[PDB]
C-alpha cells in the first residue's frame, strides 16, 4: 500500500524501485489575447523518474509537439506519463526492471496501472510523503536540457553526483529532499546559498557543487534555516 | 396456471414466490402455491424463523417439469425436487387444491412488475451461471460467491457470472489504454456484446438475474455484478439507442421494486452518482434518474 514515514527505509533496500513525478510534464504560461481573453502557451516538460537507492534519474523530456491538437491536456499528461514510464520499463533488461513504482500523485495510479497490465508483478504504489520533486526544474542543468529540447528525448543523470562514494543512499536521499524542499520554498535564497563561495564549482559531469563533507554540513544547516524562516513567514508563527 | 406443491411445512418459515411472501407456522397445513403464471422464470425462497441468516431458494420454469418442495430434516432445508410421474403429480395437486391447502400466486391483472424484472431472464442462461446439470431448477443462497470473488473457494457452489474487470487486458487494447479506460465502448460492444453475450438480450438477462439474486438473497457478489454491468454501459460513449431505452426501463422497475429500507446496502453510491450525473449516458436514463431522485435522494 501507501509509502509513508513508517516504511521509509524500504526505499534503500535491494528491491529495484522508481519514484515517478508527473508535476513538470504539462507546463504552461497563462497570457492575455489581443481581444483580452486568456490563453495558455505550453513549454517543454519532463517526467521525473528516480531510483532513490542508486540516484539514477530517467529524465524523459516532453516536447510541446506532443500536445499539438490534443484536448483535456492535464488529463492526457497523466496518460502520456504512464505511456512513457511503461515504455522505459519495457526498454530495461528484465533484471533492471523495477519491482515497485511509487507515484508522487494519486491521480497517476489508474493511468500507470492500465499501462503496466503486461507487468502484473510490478506493484504501483502511492505515497503519503509530500516530496519536493516539482523543484527538479530549479536544478539549472535539468532546466537547461528540457528548455533546449527540439524533439522528445530521454536524458540519464545521477541526481546524487558522486555522494554515494562517501554517504549511504538514506543520507543521499535526505540531502536531495532537503535541497529540493529549499529550492521549492525560496528558489532565489537556496541558489544563493549553493553558489555564494565562487571557489566551489559544479563539475561538468555533476548537477551540484563539489562540497567537502564539512561544507555539506554548513550547506545543509543553511537550507534548514531557509526552510524554517519561510515557514514562520507563511503562517505568521 | 402451474402449481408447486409442498409435502409439508415442518418448520416455521417465511416463503417468498417472486416479489410476494407469506409466513408459515411450524406444522401449519400448507401444501404449496397454485396459479403460477406460465411464460416467466420464478423463484421460490425461504428464510427460517429461527435463523434469519441464509436466505435460500430455487429458480424454476414450470414449462420444464413438475416441481415440488419437501423439507429435509437431515440437511435442514426446504428442497426443490422434480416428480417424473405426471399422473402421481396431477393427483397430488388436485387433492391439495380440493382441500384448499394452497396459496394463490397473488398477481394483480394490471401489474407487469414480474414480467418487467424478468423480461430477458431465461432458465437456460440461469443453469449456465448456476451449474447443477442433473436438476432443471437452480439453487441460490445468501452466501454463494462468484467466480470473480473466488479469483481475488468451492467451484461447484459458485455463481459463474461473466467476469467484468475495467483494469484487465480483456478491457484494454494495447495502444488504446487511455481511450479504452475512459470510453468502454470497445469492451461493451466488441468483447462483451459481440464476443461473449452474442446479443443485448443475454447481457440484460444476466444483469436482471444478478439484481434479483442481490434483492432476494442479499447475495453481495450478485450486487457487485449488477453494478458492474450497469457501469460498463453508462461508461461507454457509443451504445445502441434501443439498449439505452431498454436499460432505462430495466433499472426503473428494479429501483421501484427494491425494499425502501435496503437502499443503504444494495445500492453503490459511487456507481449511481457516476451513472446518473458524470457518465456519457448521464442524460439517457430519464425514468431511472426521476425514480432515484424521488425515492433515494440521500444516496445522491
UniProtKB/Swiss-Prot annotation, chain A:
Q: Where is the signal peptide?
A: none
Effect on the protein upon substituting residue 105 to K: Severely impaired growth. Reduced growth at 30 degrees Celsius. Strongly reduced growth at 16 degrees Celsius
State the residue spans of region: RNase H homology domain. 7-237
Subcellular location field: Nucleus
Instruction: Provide the function of this protein.
Output: Functions as a scaffold that mediates the ordered assembly of spliceosomal proteins and snRNAs. Required for association of BRR2 with the spliceosomal U5 snRNP, and the subsequent assembly of the U4/U6-U5 tri-snRNP complex. Functions as a scaffold that positions spliceosomal U2, U5 and U6 snRNAs at splice sites on pre-mRNA substrates, so that splicing can occur. Interacts with both the 5' and the 3' splice site, as well as the branch region. Has a role in branch site-3' splice site selection. Associates with the branch site-3' splice 3'-exon region. Also has a role in cell cycle.
- Relay the domain remarks: The MPN (JAB/Mov34) domain has structural similarity with deubiquitinating enzymes, but lacks the residues that would bind the catalytic metal ion. Contains a region with structural similarity to reverse transcriptase, presenting the classical thumb, fingers and palm architecture, but lacks enzyme activity, since the essential metal-binding residues are not conserved.
Q: How does it assemble?
A: Component of the U4/U6-U5 tri-snRNP complex composed of the U4, U6 and U5 snRNAs and at least PRP3, PRP4, PRP6, PRP8, PRP18, PRP31, PRP38, SNU13, SNU23, SNU66, SNU114, SPP381, SMB1, SMD1, SMD2, SMD3, SMX2, SMX3, LSM2, LSM3, LSM4, LSM5, LSM6, LSM7, LSM8, BRR2 and DIB1.
Q: What else is known?
A: Present with 468 molecules/cell in log phase SD medium.
The molecule here is called: Pre-mRNA-splicing factor 8
Segment of the intact protein contained: 1836 to 2069 of 2413
Swiss-Prot record, chain B:
- State the Gene Ontology BP annotations: spliceosomal snRNP assembly; spliceosomal tri-snRNP complex assembly
Q: Which residues carry this modification: Phosphoserine?
A: 236
Q: Check the record and name the Pfam families matching this protein.
A: AAR2, AAR2_1st
Q: Which UniProt keywords apply?
A: Cytoplasm, mRNA processing, mRNA splicing, Nucleus, Phosphoprotein
Which portions of the sequence form the region Leucine-zipper? 244-265
Q: Where in the cell is it found?
A: Cytoplasm; Nucleus
GO cellular component terms, alphabetically, are: cytoplasm; U5 snRNP
- Signal peptide residue numbers: none
Phosphothreonine modification sites? 257
User: What does the UniProt record report as the effect of altering residue 236 to A in this chain?
Assistant: No effect on interaction with PRP8
UniProt xrefs under CDD domains? Aar2_C, Aar2_N
- Write out the PTM section of this UniProt entry: Phosphorylated on serine and tyrosine residues.
Q: Which family does it belong to?
A: Belongs to the AAR2 family.
Quaternary structure, from the entry: Heterodimer. Interacts with PRP8 (via RNase H homology domain and MPN domain), competing with BRR2 for the same binding site. Component of a U5 snRNP complex that contains at least the U5 snRNA, PRP8, SNU114, AAR2, SMB1, SMD1, SMD2, SMD3, SME1, SMX2 and SMX3, but is not a component of the U4/U6-U5 tri-snRNP complex.
Biological role = Component of the U5 snRNP complex that is required for spliceosome assembly and for pre-mRNA splicing. Involved in splicing pre-mRNA of the A1 cistron and other genes that are important for cell growth.
Q: What else is known?
A: Present with 7330 molecules/cell in log phase SD medium.
Name of this chain's protein: A1 cistron-splicing factor AAR2
- Organism of origin is Saccharomyces cerevisiae (strain ATCC 204508 / S288c)
